Amino acid sequence: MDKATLVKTIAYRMGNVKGQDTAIDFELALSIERLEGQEFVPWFLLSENNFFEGTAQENRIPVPRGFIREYEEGSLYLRRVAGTGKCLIKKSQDQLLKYEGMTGEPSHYSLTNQYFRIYPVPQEDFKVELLFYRKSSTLNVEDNPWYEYAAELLVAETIWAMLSARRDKMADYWKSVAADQMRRLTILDAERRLANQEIFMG
């Protein structure tokens, strides 16, 4: 679906409302903003490979712009000039204080709020790569991913906001509908992730 069909469907299923059209757009943007703030991150918010170049003597690497969380089946990889690389390992900061002053290529990291820290402090310019989840407004794609894959969740959320203002009771029905849609979306993500994969112990 697209924005026009979304607005038309939201207006139709809210009681064939016709006067309001701008509030629907406002609460449709706010619905996506609210959904991005919750704990569950769908698969379509995963970014592409991004590389960072940094100066010598700074261990702090700022977090990417729309960082929500990192991707577990992924890693921060140091790409050496020759094209080879190693995967850096995450530990807590307390655990990485032994290394201050030991010298060499970077080998470990910690995330403290807005910054990634490379504790084996490089003495020369480096380059790292990362895969992580991002807010949509910052992805490079053509259309909001949400519109294509999560359209029915969005409709319900918008209808809930609008009705909630009117103080209607119907709102709790649409919140239950949205909760069911998100529950199904989680199972769909799990099924997509695990397809054609065989697990061996050890």
Binding site: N49, N50, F52
Partner: peptide, 19 residues
């Protein structure tokens, strides 16, 4: 600050096995 992104895979279409 300095994060950059990779250019997309240029070849883009799968074909089909006919009936």
């Amino acid at each position: 600050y300095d994060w950059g992104r990779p250019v997309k895979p240029v070849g883009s279409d799968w074909s089909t096995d006919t009936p």
